[PDB]
Symmetry: C3
Subunit: 213 residues, 3 copies
């Protein structure tokens, strides 16, 4: 199987986990701006498009940290070996969105082939989940390309035990000499602390400042 049961008994977060899961269930959202000045340059020297690269980079970062790939399966806590991005797609024609996923791959060119393929096949499918059930080993990525925002937060009526992170991007902006992308991260406190989210963001930024291949 593609996940491994986690050793809660010996975890340094064991008390945190029970506290934030059942005693005081909560989570948080944070919005920060990622500098994509370097990445804009890289993309310019290539044929990649922005959105597919950001999915790639975000999935890559998530796949490096266990605490972003936890879930409850059969009442037990597991870590997925790896997770695939579930991203939103906007249909111009109906002005509605759909959520799709494709397999992640550490090889950026194979990821692009996966993405183009999924898009080829469901570009005109206006169902909300054209592919049917969402694979359990997922992360959620959404984009609001039409507007910049300083904050985004999802108010959810019930989030018991849903630990996959939700990342939302807005339209980027030029702030002085920099091109900044607002990114909102929303997690559950049972599995993730402020530290973990900050480590994800610092890692993402690093990725944005590095060669693609």
């Amino acid at each position: 199987m593609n996940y491994t049961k986690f050793d809660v008994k010996n975890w340094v977060r064991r008390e945190h986990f029970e506290f934030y899961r059942h005693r005081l269930p909560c989570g948080f959202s944070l919005t920060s701006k990622i500098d994509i000045t370097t990445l804009k340059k890289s993309l310019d020297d290539s044929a990649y498009k922005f959105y597919p690269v950001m999915i790639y980079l975000i999935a890559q970062a998530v796949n490096q940290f266990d605490e972003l790939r936890m879930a409850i399966k059969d009442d037990e806590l597991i870590v997925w070996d790896s997770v695939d991005p579930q991203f939103t797609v906007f249909h111009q024609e109906t002005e509605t969105f759909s959520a799709l996923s494709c397999p992640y791959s550490s090889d950026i060119d194979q990821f692009m082939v996966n993405y183009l393929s999924v898009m080829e096949r469901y570009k005109s499918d206006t169902k909300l989940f054209p592919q049917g059930v969402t694979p359990e080993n997922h992360l959620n990525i959404s984009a609001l390309p039409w507007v910049n925002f300083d904050s985004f937060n999802l108010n959810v009526a019930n989030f018991t035990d849903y630990f996959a992170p939700i990342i939302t991007m807005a339209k980027y902006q030029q702030e002085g000499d920099r091109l900044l992308l607002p990114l909102s991260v929303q997690v559950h406190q049972a599995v993730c602390d402020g530290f973990h989210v900050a480590r994800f963001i610092n890692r993402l930024q690093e990725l944005c400042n590095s060669k693609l291949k």
Copy 2:
């Protein structure tokens, strides 16, 4: 009657609506900065005050999009022909707020007459709802003039089926050559997507950049 029953059966958002209403009930808030550099100029060339104009402009924008004027009435989904602003008023003397509403009008001078009239009559009424029951065809507007903010979010214990948008303004600020007003929009996902909110904001900005009359 002043509303029309909506055709859910043939709506391109029909699956979205059921999903976000009953399967995974949620909403979101977003905060963005509206450039009010042009509007400050217009106001300077006139006798209008800032707050009443922002209510006006926001109500005007809301009244152009159906998805911001939905509600459940008798278990059915309706669109109001038009909605009136319900705005907050601060009382200096008690340091408490009240919520008022007046009829919207596409004629800015009649709107001002409505506003001055409502204010005349309830300026000193410290009840929370001096007028009694809030008309069902409303939008909510609030202002935090004493402080600038980058984000605002309302955490609500229960929001089942309340689809009127909540807009909150902070104190504006000079950012370089621009005067920016932080505005927070909070909607329910059953009726509104990221697209819709972004379209409201882009429309509001346009309005701010145009002649008043």
Copy 3:
């Protein structure tokens, strides 16, 4: 006793309180940037560290306003004479956090002695609440020093009657000639309005712009 029963009967917020407590239970979070340019200078001319001073300053501000020190005790509404800060501590070694508190004092040097003492004694205690039960007369302060954010919000599954404010700080940043610290304030609407939060923030800023002793 260290609290006083509040006169709800004659309060100008009496209707607000019942409304926001039981009819439409809610709260809000707001994130604003505090200019700590002056304070950086003061700290430079001294031996104080940043975090302990911010706890100090925030607790000082809270202790000046009643509406930030309310609670329900025995079904009644009370105001604490004073509240102590409950702050988070990060352990590098385990990469987990703990929450501690020490007695507040209006004398900054005695506060520092209290803080160093509590830290001395529990620096290596990785329990979530090394001291055991949190004193009821508390405010919550947390810090995310590793990342800057524009917004922070806690999504809480149940907040019935918890009125202590939650303040969260991010990493500060240089914005032009200024050093700004993002601060998020999260309150319950039964006890606090936008006015109150804005008054807390304006007061905090004032404090940051003043001599320490």
